[PDB]
Structure 1
Amino acid sequence: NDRKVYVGKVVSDKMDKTITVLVETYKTHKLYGKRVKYSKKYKTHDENNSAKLGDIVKIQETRPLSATKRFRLVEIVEES
């Protein structure tokens, strides 16, 4: 099987082994049809916290870690 993967931006790295990833996507309005940008914040695990605020990273889901995290850091591609 396959676990879902998201690509977002690091908006918080103030906690150890944890970063906040902002995955912005698009949702159309049911009535008017205009596509509206909405964003969702994901809390992801990274044992070696090499991600710094401003990096676009690759996120994949996993089993529940802590009360909120359900994702792990797969790939870091930006430098900022």
Structure 2
Amino acid sequence: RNDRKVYVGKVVSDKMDKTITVLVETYKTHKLYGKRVKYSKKYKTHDENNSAKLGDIVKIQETRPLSATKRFRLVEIVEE
């Protein structure tokens, strides 16, 4: 029933075995001056088969803790 958060982002490093780090980009607004400013957050997600490669735009979903800092799992590779 209840679904879990899903994010789409580019892969910025895959040197780890079966792990890819996904860079999700957002635009937070300055609380006083109101301007839109870029915000990048790197997500450590599980890559079981090493299918994802550095550069491709992938989709990840939140899971239970899988490692010290891995909390997400790769769902599909939207683009490459």
Q: Shift of residue 34 of structure 1?
A: 0.2
Provide the rounded CA distance (Å) in 2 between the counterparts of 1:23 and 1:77.
14
- Structure 1 unaligned residues grouped into runs of 5+: none
Q: Is 1:24 aligned to 2:9, yes or no?
A: no
- After superposition, give the CA deviation of every residue in 1:31-59 in whole Å (9 maximum; x if it has no partner): 00001111000000011011110000001
CA distance in 2, matches of 1:26, 1:74: 24
Residues 7-49 of structure 1, C-alpha deviations (whole Å, 9 max, x = no match)? 0000000011100000000100000000111100000001101
Match of 1:2 in 2: 3
State the distance in 2 between where 1:74 and 1:24 align: 18
Residue in 2 that maps onto 1:60: 61
> Distance in 2 between the 1:65 and 1:20 partners?
14
TM superposition shift of 1:77: 2.0
Unaligned runs of 5+ in 2: none
Query: What is the aligned-residue identity percentage?
Result: 100
**Root mean square deviation, CA, Å:** 0.6
TM-score by length of 1: 0.96
Following superposition, which runs of at least 4 residues in structure 1 exceed 2 angstroms of deviation? none
